[PDB]
Amino acid sequence: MNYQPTPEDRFTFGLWTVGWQGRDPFGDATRRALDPVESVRRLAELGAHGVTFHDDDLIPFGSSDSEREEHVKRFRQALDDTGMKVPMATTNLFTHPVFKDGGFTANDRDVRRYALRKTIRNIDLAVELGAETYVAWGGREGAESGGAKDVRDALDRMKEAFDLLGEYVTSQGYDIRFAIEPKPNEPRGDILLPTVGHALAFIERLERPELYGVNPEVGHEQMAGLNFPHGIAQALWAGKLFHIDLNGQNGIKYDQDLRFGAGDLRAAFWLVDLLESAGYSGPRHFDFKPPRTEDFDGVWASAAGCMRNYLILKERAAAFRADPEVQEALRASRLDELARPTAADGLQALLDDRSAFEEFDVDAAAARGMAFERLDQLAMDHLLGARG
Amino acid sequence: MNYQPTPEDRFTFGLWTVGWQGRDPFGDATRRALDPVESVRRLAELGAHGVTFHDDDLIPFGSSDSEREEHVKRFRQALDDTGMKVPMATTNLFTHPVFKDGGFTANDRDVRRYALRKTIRNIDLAVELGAETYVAWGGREGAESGGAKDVRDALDRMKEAFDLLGEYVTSQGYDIRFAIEPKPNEPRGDILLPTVGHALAFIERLERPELYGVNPEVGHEQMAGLNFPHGIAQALWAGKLFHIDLNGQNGIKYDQDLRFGAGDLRAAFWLVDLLESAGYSGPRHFDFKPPRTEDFDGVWASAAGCMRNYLILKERAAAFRADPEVQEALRASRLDELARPTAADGLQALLDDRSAFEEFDVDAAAARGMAFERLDQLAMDHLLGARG
Amino acid sequence: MNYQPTPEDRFTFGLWTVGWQGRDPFGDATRRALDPVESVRRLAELGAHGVTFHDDDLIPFGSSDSEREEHVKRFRQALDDTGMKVPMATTNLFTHPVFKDGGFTANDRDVRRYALRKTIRNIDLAVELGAETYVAWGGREGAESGGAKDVRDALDRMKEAFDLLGEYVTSQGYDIRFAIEPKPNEPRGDILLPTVGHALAFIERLERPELYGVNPEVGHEQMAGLNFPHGIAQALWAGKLFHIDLNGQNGIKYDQDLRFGAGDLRAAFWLVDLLESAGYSGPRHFDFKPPRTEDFDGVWASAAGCMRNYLILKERAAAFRADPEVQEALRASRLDELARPTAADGLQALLDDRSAFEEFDVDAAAARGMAFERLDQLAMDHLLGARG
Amino acid sequence: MNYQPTPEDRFTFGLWTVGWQGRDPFGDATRRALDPVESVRRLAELGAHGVTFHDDDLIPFGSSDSEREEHVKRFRQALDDTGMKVPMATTNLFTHPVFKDGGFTANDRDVRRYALRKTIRNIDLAVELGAETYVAWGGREGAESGGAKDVRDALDRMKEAFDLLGEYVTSQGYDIRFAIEPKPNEPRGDILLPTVGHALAFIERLERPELYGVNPEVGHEQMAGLNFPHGIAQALWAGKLFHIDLNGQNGIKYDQDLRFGAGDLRAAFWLVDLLESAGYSGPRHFDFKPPRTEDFDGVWASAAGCMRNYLILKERAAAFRADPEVQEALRASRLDELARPTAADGLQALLDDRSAFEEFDVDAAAARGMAFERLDQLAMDHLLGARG
Numbered sequence A, B, C, D: 001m002n003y004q005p006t007p008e009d010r011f012t013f014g015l016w017t018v019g020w021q022g023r024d025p026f027g028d029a030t031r032r033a034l035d036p037v038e039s040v041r042r043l044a045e046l047g048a049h050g051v052t053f054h055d056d057d058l059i060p061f062g063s064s065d066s067e068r069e070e071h072v073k074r075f076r077q078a079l080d081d082t083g084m085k086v087p088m089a090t091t092n093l094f095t096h097p098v099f100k101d102g103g104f105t106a107n108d109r110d111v112r113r114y115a116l117r118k119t120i121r122n123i124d125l126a127v128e129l130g131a132e133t134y135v136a137w138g139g140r141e142g143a144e145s146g147g148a149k150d151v152r153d154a155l156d157r158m159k160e161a162f163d164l165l166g167e168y169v170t171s172q173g174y175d176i177r178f179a180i181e182p183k184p185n186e187p188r189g190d191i192l193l194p195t196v197g198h199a200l201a202f203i204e205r206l207e208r209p210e211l212y213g214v215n216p217e218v219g220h221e222q223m224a225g226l227n228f229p230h231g232i233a234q235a236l237w238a239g240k241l242f243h244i245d246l247n248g249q250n251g252i253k254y255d256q257d258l259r260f261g262a263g264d265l266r267a268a269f270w271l272v273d274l275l276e277s278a279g280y281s282g283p284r285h286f287d288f289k290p291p292r293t294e295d296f297d298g299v300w301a302s303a304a305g306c307m308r309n310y311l312i313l314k315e316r317a318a319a320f321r322a323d324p325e326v327q328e329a330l331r332a333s334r335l336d337e338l339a340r341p342t343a344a345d346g347l348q349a350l351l352d353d354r355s356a357f358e359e360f361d362v363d364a365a366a367a368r369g370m371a372f373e374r375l376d377q378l379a380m381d382h383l384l385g386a387r388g
C-alpha cells in the first residue's frame, strides 16, 4: 500500500504554514524566512495542487507599487514553472498594530475604512491569480472585556463590511465567492462569529447571502469542544461549505495547528468519510504549523504527513462503507429509516394514525437495542486495518 | 437597599427546577417529590410571576384521559388562587427509554411519529393554559459515535418535524411561537444544534422561520466555553430571542444548573446589562437545580436567590450606564464611533477617498490606546459597589 | 490477524460496568438489572480474567447478615465454576443520600464514622475473596460552593480516614494495598484530590505511605484536559501505579465512560505503549458504561471491544518499538541522550566546564532540528497499519 | 471607602508584566519597550512593594560582563531611590531558540548543562539583590507528540537538575528557597508537572524537599478547569505555598494573564479569603499582561487595578467572616464539625461503637439539609456589598 498524493487530490497549503518561523508568545523564531518562490517549488515537488496567501505574505506591508509588481511577477513565474494553482486568497487584518481592536469592527471608524480598502485591493489581485474563494478570518474582531464592544453594533458593522464587499465583486463582474472562517477565541479573549453555526446564521442576514459560505477549521471548532464532522454536516446541509481548513488539535486549549491526522484521529476519520461521501469538490487546504522544534527537513516531513494521513483515512473510510458487513450493521441500526421521511403522508394523516400514539406500543419500541456499539467497533477495526 | 421581587419583574420557574429530587448519575434522590400545586403556591409567595412545565411534570406518563383532566383542573385552581401565569410549556422527549436515540431524529421512524403526536397533544394544552412560547430541547437528538447518526439526514428529519408543528399551529389558528433550546452535549455525547448559532442557522431553513426563535441557557453556551452575552446579542440582533433560561455554570464540565448569579458572576452582570438595555420583555425564567445537599428550606432559599441576584445585578448595571464618568469612558474608547456607519457615503466614495488608504496614517492610528482597561475597572467598581 | 483475549491478559471488569442499567440525569433505565452471577459467567466466556465490585453491587444495601451470607456464597460458587478472580474491591460511599456531602470528609462527624465502618466491613470481605487492591473513589468529597468546605480541614479528615484504614489493615495482618482514584468533578462541582498529581502528593503525607498508590482513570484526567500517558508516567516514576481504570472520553465534558479505545485513540496507543514497555503487571480493568442505546447484545459487544482494542494497540505499539527505522528515528531525536545523566561528573565539574557556558555555541545548538515530526508520522503509520 | 495600596500590602510585579510589548502569536508589538528603571519608578508611585525579574529582562541576552555590571548598577540605583525590594527572581529558559525542546529536560544533553549554568549565574545575582524565593517555570519542558519525550527519563532529568541546584545553594550557604510554577500547556502541547498537585508530588522525591515549594498561578490551574482556591488550600496544607502569581483567566483556553479580579471573580474572592485567613505572609505578585489594545496610560491603569481589586476583595472577605449571621450559618452547615477529628477515640473504640454502624440511623442523617445555599447567598451578598 502507498499513499502518494497527486495534483488531482486538490491538496493546498498557505504560504504562511510551511513558512511559519516558529515565533510563539514565549519564544523567538527558530527558522529563517522562506521565499514564497521556494515554498511553491518545494510544495509542487511533494505533490500539492496549489497554494494560498494573505496579501502581506506575498507583498511586504508598505511596499511601493513598483515593488508590489516585482513580487507578483516572481510569484507568477513560479506558478507557471510548476503548474501550481491559487484557489483561495485572504487578507491580513490581524498582524499590524493598527488592527489591535479589529478591522471590520474596530471601534475607530477610520480603521474600519482602511480595513475595507486593504481588502478590496487584494480581491483584485486574487482574481488576477485565478482564485475562486476569498476567505475572511476576523481574528481581531472581538473583545477581552464586556464594555469594550457592543456586539449588536459590531454585527451591524460586520454586515455593512461584507455587504460592501459583495457590492464590489458584483459591480466588477468577478466570479469569486467569500468564505467566513469562524474561531471562538485567540488572539482576542472572545471572537465574534465564534463557530460554524454563528457564521451560517450571520450569512442569512447579508444582502446577497448566495455569495457567502463558511471556511471551517478542524482545530477551531474543537477549541469549543464541538464535533467537527457534525458542524461540517450542517454546513453541507445548508449548501455553504465553500472551503475547508484541515489540521489537528488536542482538545480545548490554545490553537495548536498540528498537521492533519494529529489531534483527534477518530474525528479526522469521520471527517474524511463525510467529505468523500458528500462529494465535496473544493480544495483540501492545510492550515497548520510545523512545530518550532523542527528544522526545514521536519517542515517538509510535516507537510507530506498532512497529505499522507488524508489519503490513508480516505482508503479506510471507503473500505468501511463498501464492506457488506458494515452495510448490514447500518441497516441493523436503522440508518436506512433515518433517511426516510417521518410523515410524507402529511399532518392530517399523522393526526389520524392510531398506530402513532393511541395504539403505539412504547415498551416494545423502547426494548429494541440500537446496535451502535457493534457498528462503532466495525468502524474502529476498519480505521486500524484490523479486519478479518 | 432591598431587592424584593414582584410579579412585574416576570420571574418564572419550571416545575422541574424546585421539584428536582436530587437524583444524579451516581446517587439516589435526597428529597421527596413536590406536588405541582404546592410549588405554585410557594413560588407565588416568593414573588414569582409564573411557572412552566413539561407535559410529564404535570400529568404522569401514561395517565388515563380521566386522570389527565383531574391533574389539569387542580393545577388550574392553584393558578387561579395565586394569580400565577404559565407563559411557556415544553415536551418531555428525553426521560422515557423509548426516546433513548432521540424523539424527532430517532433512527426508528415509528418513534419519530410518536414524538410528534406527544408534542402536538401538549401544544393544545399549552394554549389552553395561556402559554405564549413553546420550547423544544432536543436533549436526546445526537450521538455517542460517528456511524450512528447521519447528520444531514437527521437535520432533514428535524426540519420535517418543526415544519409539521408550524403547519399544525397555523392551521389551528394558535398564537404561540416556538423556541429551540441548544445544548452542546449531555445526555448525548454530542447533541444536534449545539449552540445558539447552530440553532439560529437552522431556523432560516424552516418553511415559516418567523414562527421560530431561540431559548438560550446560560450554562449551555458556557459548556462550550462561549461568551453567553455575545451569543444573546447575536440572537437579539437577529430578532430571535423569544425566551431565555437563567442559571449558573462553573466552566466546561457537566451542566450544573446552579442558581442564577453563581458560576460566572461577571458574565451574569454583562447579561443583565444587555437584556435591560435592549428592552427584552419576555420572561426571566430560571432553569436551575437546587443542589442535592439541600432540604426544602434550601430549595426555597436557592430559588429566592435566583431572583435576588438578578435584581442586584440590574441595579448595578443601571448605575454603571447612568454614571457620567462611565459615559465619558465609553466615548474615550470610541463606542460612539462603533455605532456609526463605516461607509454611509457608499462604495464608490469609499474607493475615491484617499484618506482611507493612500493617505491614511497607519502609525498614528495604531498608537491610539483603546482605554478598555480603565472602562473595565469602572465596570468592576460598579459591580462590587465600590464607587467613590 | 486475530485478537482473542485469554485470562493471561488480566482483563477485568466491575460488576457495575456491564451491569449499568442506563439511568442518566435525564432518563430512566433502559436495561433490566443483571444478576452478578450472570455477569461473571458471561464475562468468563468473553475471556476476562476477573471481576471487581463495590460492597453494594454484591450485597443490597441494608441486607440482613443472613442475606449477606447468601449473596456471597452464590457469588463464590460462580467464581469457582468459572475460574474468575477478584483482584480489587471498593466501597460505595456515593449513592445513598446519607453521603450527599461526602463519606470521609462529610461535614457531619457521625457520617464520617459511618463511612469508615462501612469501608472496614468491606475490606474484610475483599480479603476473603482474595483481592489485592482496595480502591477508594471519593466521588462525593468536595463542594458546589466556596464556603461549604474548608479544604484544609477536609484534607485533615481525609488523612485521618486513610491513616485509620492503614492501621486496621496492618493490625489485622492483611496483604492488601489501597489505591486512590482521582476525578476532578462530577458528581460534586469540584472533587478533592482532582488529579493523579494531587493524589500522589497527598499520599506522601499519610503515616504509612508505602500502603497507598493511585488508580487513575483515562477519562478522569482527560476531563481536566490533561495528558493521561504523562500522568501515568509520573505515577510509574513514583512507584505508585497500583491499579488502572481503562475507558474512553471525548474531551472536557461529563464523564462518558466509553469503551476503551473510543475517545482519544492516539492517547490510548501511547498509554498501551507505556504500560507494556514499563512492565506494568497489574490488572487491566475496564471502568466503562455500555451506552444506554444498547440492549444486552450491545453490552457484551462493547465489553468485548474493550479487550479487542487493547490487544490491537498492544500489537501496534510493539511493532513500532521493534521497527529498526523507528529505533534510528529515536536516536535522531536524541531520546538516547535524554536517558543519560546531565551531570554525572558532579556540580563542581559542571561549574568548571567551559563548554557548558563560556564556550557553548548556542546558535549551533539552536539550529539542530529535533526530527519529532518524522518520528510522530512513523508512530501514526504503525498505529494505522500503513507501514511499507 | 478607598482602597489605596501601600508597600505594607506586599504587592509585587514582574518587569515583564507592565513591560509586555503586546506581541502575540498573530500580531506585532503595540507598545515600545520600557526601561526597567522606568518601570521601577512608576510602580513605586502606584504603591507597589517590589519587582521581580528574569535574568534576560534585566540583562540583555549575550551581554558582556562589563555591560552586565552596568545594567545591574542602574537597576540598583533605582531600587535605592524608590525603596522597592526584589523578593523573587527567575531564569528565562524559554525564549531563546536553543530552549525549543526545554532547558532542564531538553533531549540534547549539552543544552541541559547550559540551562543549569544559566540558572546558577542568575541565582547568585538574585541573592545579591536580596531575593528570598527563586522561581522555576519549565515552560518548554514537555512535548507536542508522544514519542518525542520519555516522561520517566524526563522526570529523572528534572529531578537531577533541581537536586544540583539544591546542592549549589546549600554549598554556597545561601538563604534562598525554590518555587516551582506549574502550567498545563502553552507553549508546549503538554507541559511536565502540569498542576499544583503534580508539582507537590514531584518535590517529595527531591533529595532536600524542604528547599522546594510551589508558585501556583490563578490562570494556570484554571486552564485545566480546576478550582484554584482548592489547589492553594492543598499547598498550604502541605506547608509548600512559597509564592503566588495572581491574575485572571476566562476558562479553558489560551492563558490570558488578565489583571487580577478579571476572569473568575468569585474564585478571586474565595482565594483572598483563604490567603488572608491562613496568614499567608509572602508577596502578592501579579503575573499579568496589560492587553495589547492599551497604551501606556492603560498599562498603569491595569496594574493599579490588580491592587485595587485585591484590596476590595480583602475587605469583603473580612466582612463576610466577621458577620455574626455568617458565623451562625457556618455552624448550621456544620463547618465546626468538619474541624473536629472523626475518631480521636481511636480505631478500636470506633470498631466497638454501635452508634457508628449497627445503630446508626442513616435515614435521619440523610434527611438533614446542609444549608449550603443560604450560606453561599450570604457570601454573594457580602461580595456585592448588598448586606442589609
Ligand SMILES: O=C[C@H](O)[C@@H](O)[C@H](O)[C@H](O)CO
Pocket (backbone or CB within 6 Å): A089, A090, A091, A135, A136, A137, A139, A181, A183, A217, A245, A255, A287
Ligand atoms: O487561527 C487562524 C486562522 O486559521 C487563519 O490562518 C485563517 O485561516 C487565515 O488567516 C484566513 O485566510
Ligand SMILES: O=C[C@H](O)[C@@H](O)[C@H](O)[C@H](O)CO
Pocket (backbone or CB within 6 Å): B089, B090, B091, B135, B136, B137, B139, B181, B183, B217, B245, B255, B287
Ligand atoms: O439541560 C437541559 C435543558 O435546559 C432543559 O431543562 C430544557 O430547558 C427544558 O427541558 C426545555 O423546555
Ligand SMILES: O=C[C@H](O)[C@@H](O)[C@H](O)[C@H](O)CO
Pocket (backbone or CB within 6 Å): C089, C090, C091, C135, C136, C137, C139, C181, C183, C217, C245, C255, C287
Ligand atoms: O466516575 C467514577 C469512578 O470511576 C468509579 O467507578 C470508581 O472507579 C469506582 O467506584 C471505585 O472503585
Ligand SMILES: O=C[C@H](O)[C@@H](O)[C@H](O)[C@H](O)CO
Pocket (backbone or CB within 6 Å): D089, D090, D091, D135, D136, D137, D139, D181, D183, D217, D245, D255, D287
Ligand atoms: O505562563 C507563564 C508563567 O506564568 C511565567 O511568567 C512564570 O511566572 C515566570 O516566567 C516564572 O518566574
Ligand code: NI
Pocket (backbone or CB within 6 Å): A183, A217, A220, A255, A257, A287
Ligand atoms: Ni486557525
Ligand code: NI
Pocket (backbone or CB within 6 Å): A217, A219, A220, A255, A256, A257
Ligand atoms: Ni487554528
Ligand code: NI
Pocket (backbone or CB within 6 Å): A181, A217, A245, A287
Ligand atoms: Ni484557518
Ligand code: NI
Pocket (backbone or CB within 6 Å): B183, B217, B220, B255, B257, B287
Ligand atoms: Ni439545561
Ligand code: NI
Pocket (backbone or CB within 6 Å): B217, B219, B220, B255, B256, B257
Ligand atoms: Ni443546563
Ligand code: NI
Pocket (backbone or CB within 6 Å): B181, B217, B245, B287
Ligand atoms: Ni433549559
Ligand code: NI
Pocket (backbone or CB within 6 Å): C183, C217, C220, C255, C257, C287
Ligand atoms: Ni470514572
Ligand code: NI
Pocket (backbone or CB within 6 Å): C217, C219, C220, C255, C256, C257
Ligand atoms: Ni469515569
Ligand code: NI
Pocket (backbone or CB within 6 Å): C181, C217, C245, C287
Ligand atoms: Ni473508575
Ligand code: NI
Pocket (backbone or CB within 6 Å): D183, D217, D220, D255, D257, D287
Ligand atoms: Ni502564566
Ligand code: NI
Pocket (backbone or CB within 6 Å): D217, D219, D220, D255, D256, D257
Ligand atoms: Ni499565565
Ligand code: NI
Pocket (backbone or CB within 6 Å): D181, D217, D245, D287
Ligand atoms: Ni506566572
